[PDB]
Design a protein around this nucleic acid. Structure first.
Length: 91
DNA sequence: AATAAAAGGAATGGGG
DNA sequence: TCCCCATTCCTTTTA
């Protein structure tokens, strides 16, 4: 089953939800969610996963924060903005 | 106040 | 057994 960080990277590469998520500095791997349209993207994540409940952006971001220690995704000090690691971007 | 982002502890659930 | 990789719930803090 796909991991959350890979789901997000795949969206960014395909452009499929460009109103919900976008690169800020693609060379650095920084990306940002839409304040008004992030819930549609969260819903898609939960449906892809087959989760019992409807996914919310809050719960998705709770999972994103768990990558901070291992490093795949880190929060950036800008609204709704995160950053993939170089390792993630290379693969 | 109303709204929103950010945080994380802790319990619970997936699939090995 | 017990880690993987979240999901869900609840509360707090900051803007």
């Amino acid at each position: 089953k796909i991991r959350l960080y890979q789901f997000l990277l795949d969206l960014l590469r395909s452009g499929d939800m460009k109103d919900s998520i976008w690169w800020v500095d693609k060379d650095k791997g920084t990306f940002q969610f839409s304040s008004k349209h992030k819930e549609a993207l969260a819903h898609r994540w939960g449906i892809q996963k087959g989760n019992r409940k409807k996914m919310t952006y809050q719960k998705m971001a709770r999972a994103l924060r768990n990558y901070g220690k291992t490093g795949e995704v880190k929060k950036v000090k800008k609204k709704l903005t995160y950053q993939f690691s170089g390792e993630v971007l290379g693969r």
